[PDB]
Every structure is written in structure tokens, then in C-alpha cells.
Write a protein that binds this DNA or RNA. Sequence first.
DNA 1: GTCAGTCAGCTAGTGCTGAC
DNA 2: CGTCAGCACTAGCTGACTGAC
Length: 627
Amino acid sequence: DEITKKYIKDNIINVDDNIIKKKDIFKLKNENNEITECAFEYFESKKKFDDDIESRFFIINDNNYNENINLIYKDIKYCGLNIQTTGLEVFDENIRLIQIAVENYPVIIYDMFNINKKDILDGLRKVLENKNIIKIIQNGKFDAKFLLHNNFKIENIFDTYIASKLLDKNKNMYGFKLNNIVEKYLNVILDKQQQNSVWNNSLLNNNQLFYAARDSSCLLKLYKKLKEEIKKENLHIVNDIENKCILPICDMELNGIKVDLENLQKSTNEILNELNIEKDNLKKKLKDENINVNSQQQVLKALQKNNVRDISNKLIENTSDSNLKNFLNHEEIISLRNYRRLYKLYSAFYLKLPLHINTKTNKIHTTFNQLKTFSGRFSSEKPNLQQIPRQKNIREIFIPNDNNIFIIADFKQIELKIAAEITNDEIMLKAYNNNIDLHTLTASIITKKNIPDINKEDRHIAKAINFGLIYGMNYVNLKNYANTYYGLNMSLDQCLYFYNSFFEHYKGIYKWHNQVKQKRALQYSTLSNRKVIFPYFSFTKALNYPVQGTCADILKLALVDLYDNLKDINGKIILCVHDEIIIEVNKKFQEEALKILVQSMENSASYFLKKVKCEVSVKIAENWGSK
DNA sequence: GTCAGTCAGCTAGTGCTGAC
DNA sequence: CGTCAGCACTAGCTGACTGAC
Ligand SMILES: Nc1nc2c(ncn2[C@H]2C[C@H](O)[C@@H](COP(=O)(O)OP(=O)(O)OP(=O)(O)O)O2)c(=O)[nH]1
């Protein structure tokens, strides 16, 4: 059949027909600013669509490429970019189709698999690398990862997804595909009924490419309607900062962090042997052999028939640590808690890491998402590296590459600094500029001791109670916030005394608490001005959103600045979890990397917070687990 | 010889339960 | 709190073991 093979020469199979070739005029601008009447072939659909979204497109094959098409990109200010891939695993998937939507022109689509010369793509690379031109990508993370992997460079992003979700204010957490936003903001239906059609095949059908072009083309009108809204609410700053953190996250994902195989295997052997002997000990201790040692109800029944009683002689009803922490008297309970802690560590960490280690490179690669979190913080997906245990300093399994070196840094008490900025309290400014940690000052006011006498044991109470009441936490509940968590223990009278004392001096915190309680607004804001709306008033969330949001924003600015500066020495940003940036560099450059890091984070802090200085604790470590 | 009816193993799902 | 993983229990599905006139 010639009808299906009508345009087979361009590597397109005409499955559904419904297209027609066209060769018309295009008035481009010559490099000498001379208007030239160059003509370009372009296909079009016979069946029209009711929407105004553009649907035309040129296919530029190696045998069909012409130099004059490159003139179209001249003088532009922005363009679209939609990339098609054969799969989701970036390390082992090949970029199929790269579209560009240039305004008042059809979408240029590069059939990559048929492009066998480097002289074609460099025209696209020059556009991608220039910072003066803005780029628009739906979910820019994925396309940026694939591009950077395959030897491209893209130097400006305007993620419509980020603008949409920041305008959503975390009201609806789903419905952010391209169709959703396009319907909500453009009154157009894209008809994305493509059920993930076959892509690895060299030949491609007409419907697939035509619908792919529209998904690329619609983004320009979406950007025009989005920039007006984002400027309307004065959310320009947050969008500007958030768009530039796409590239650092991409570099973290593509680099990842290496894992030591031999150390991990050795650790598995020792922990497994210890688990076996301890499980045998427990099974002996329970006085019965049929018990499945894991089951909560079975072990609870075993304890109950073993006559395990509390201080008041009452039988145990729960195995919760918050309940079992007070029942340390029994010999069996110590072994039981030991067993369960060891099993949690084993299953969570040692059986899980071998599943997520790439044998091809011996590296672990996370998946990072930025606005997925309520407060806007980073969340580590798949291997949740926010979840790697801190016990034993298990991070020594992780290491840098064969010859490089880790240089980690972290903010020292960023959260309380943000509180100091927002509340405008004189005492916290006094303490900070006098070079005294707010934990130390809190301990001093609690104990009324002289300044150097704030020992670690005393400072623990301050460290707990500060974070306790800085978020408006009930003084009755401080007993429960202590008895179960951290290492505090008190009574009601002392709870009341501490609650009175803290707000006796920290006038700013009291004022902030009273106003946040009174207003009861459905909306709250940060220093970076990101906006969120809660379904109903809630004291704890209402207090916690601004401080932690600004803390996240400072880290994001630090990340973009660090990407900007590190390029000279070929540095790479590896991981960041909780106010802690980890970079990597080959030896002989450490003396410079330390300075670049501290300067970048200092400028980051100086941008947002003016009154109070920052203080960055920096260390250079052979392994992530260095003390 | 055959086919309902009750007996199921299994599959899924919500409930509930401990962990840094 | 958030998260994830892990385990009973309860209820519905898809074939095997009868029971028969
Ligand atoms: N108990 C508790 N811990 C949380 C919660 N969310 C996060 N965390 C963890 C991760 C945070 O990084 C950590 C708070 O302690 P940090 O590690 O930030 O300590 P800090 O920077 O004060 O360290 P330093 O005093 O210098 O040793 O607690 C939560 O809701 N409850």
C-alpha cells in the first residue's frame, strides 16, 4: 500500500492518513539583517481541531536538513522544549524526539535517530546554551536530565509545572499533567489519548508525532497566561529562585553518591550473625518455640502469658516504645526491644540497598522532588536518603569516588535564625551578634547560671525546649513531647515554669504566637513570599509554615549559587537532606572548594536575611561518615 | 455421564501496628 | 507529625469434592 508508505522516505508511516504535505513561504531574517524569502516544507492535518493551539511541524532529517532553517531562532526571547524518550530510566534510554516551539512559527521537531551528523544539532545547542533565551519545559527535570546526559547544555528554564503548583498553594495535590493545566488555564482540550504508543521503532506514525507537536506548541500561550498571574501575586521572586534549582537537582541525580560494596557486605555478615544469635536468645526467653518473633499480637500474647506487668501491676496492652520505654525493668523486654531495633535496621537498610545499587557503576541514584513536600522542602524518593539510619554512623559505607574528597557544610541553627528575622525580637539579635548560640542563651535563662557554665547536659534541655515552644506547643503537651521523644523528663509544675520563663523574655515569640492565633487566616506567607492555603485554621501548621519555608528557600538559593561558582574546578553536588550540602571534588583543589562553599552559602544567607549573620560549620571528610 | 452447591486457596483490600 | 513496610482478618472469586435421582 502506497497510502501508508506515502511519505515513508521521511521515516514516517502514514497509518491513519489525515495529513498533507505543504511547501509555502517563510520570511526569515538573514544574518546581515536582510529579509530573505526562504521556503520550507511543512506537513499539516487534513482534519482540523476546534482549538487555536498550533499543530504544524517540520521534520528535519539528515537528508532533509537545510542551513536556512537555523535562521528562525534569531532574535527570539523564549521557546518551548518537549523531549520524547524511549523510556523512564535515563541512564539506559535514548532521546527520541526534541521539539522547539518558536512563536508565530511551526514546531521544529528533530528526528534524532535519523540525524547522523553533528553539524545539525549544534544549531539547537547554541540556542540551548545562551542564557538570554528563556526555555519552557513541562516537568523540566526529566528533559534536563536526559539532555545533560546526552551531551547538551541548557541554561534557562521556565517550568510551567512549578508556576502552576505554586499557584495551586497545595490545595489540590493531583491533576497537574499538561492537559490539566491547559484545561484550567486555556479552555482547550489537548486529547492526550495516546496510550504510550510504541516509540523504540524507527518508523513513527502520523497521529503520534502530530499530537506530540501540540503538547510542545501550547506551552507558549500557557506561559503568556502564567507570567501575568505569577506577577499579579508578587510571587516573582519565588518562581525566579525555584526555576534555577532544577539544574542543581539534575546534577545531583546524574552524579549520585557511590556505595562501598565490600563494607556493605561485611556489615551484612556481622549484623546477620548478631540477628541470628539474638533471635535465638529471644526465642529461648519467650519460653515457647512456635512464636513468630515479628508479629506484634503474637509477641504481645507471649509476654502476657509470661506475666509481664507494669509498675502498677497491670498487664501490658501495647508494645509501643512510648509505652515500653517505662518498662525497662523486665529482662526479656530489653532483648525484645534490641531484637526489634535490629530487625528494623536490617530490613530497612541492608536488604534494601542491594536492590537500588547499579552494578554497572556501583552508584546509588535517588529521585528528588522539590514542591512535593507541604513546606516545600526536598524529599528523597525511591531510596529515601532522608531515611538512612544515623546509628553506628552507617554513612561510612558511602564514600566519594576513587580519588576525590567529600567537603560537607551545614547551617548552624538556621531555623531559630529565621525565627529571629521574622519575629524581630531584640534579645535574640543581641545574643546572636554577641556570638552566643540561642541554645546556650535558653539554657542560661532556664538555669540562671553564669554564661560559660552551660554544659552539654544542661544545654540538652535548652536544645529540646527551644524547638518545643518556638512553634507554639502546648505546655500541658510538653510532658508528652518530653517523656516519649528526645531525652527530657519533667512534671506539670516545671512545665508551667519553663513555659512562663521562655515567653517572659522572648517577647517576639509571644507576640508572633498571639497574632498568628488571632488572625486565623486561610493563607500564610514566607519571606520568599511563597503562598499556601490551609483547608481550615490549625495552630501548629500556621506557625511552622513560614520559618521552615524560608529555611528551605535559603538552601535553594545556596544550591543555585554553588552551581554557579563550582564550575571552575569541575565540582559536583552530591546530596542534601536537612540543611546540609555535600559536594565532591578531585584532590589538590580542596583549599579552594572550602572557600567557594562558604562564600556561596554566605551570599545565599545575605540575600534573604539582613539583620542577623549566618554561621556555617564546615568540615572535610574522607567519607560521609566522618565525625 | 453429568452438573449444581457447598467446600475451599488465593487475591485483594482496609485496619492496625511499630520504627529515627 | 509526616513514610514506608509488614502483618492478621475479613470478604469475594474461580475449580474440586461430593450428592443426587
Ligand atoms: N523528633 C523529630 N525529629 C524530626 C522531625 N522532623 C525532622 N526531624 C529530624 C531531622 C532534623 O534534621 C532533626 C533536628 O535536629 P538537627 O539534626 O537539625 O540538629 P542541630 O542542627 O541542632 O545540630 P547540633 O545542635 O549542631 O548538633 O530532627 C520531627 O517532626 N520530629
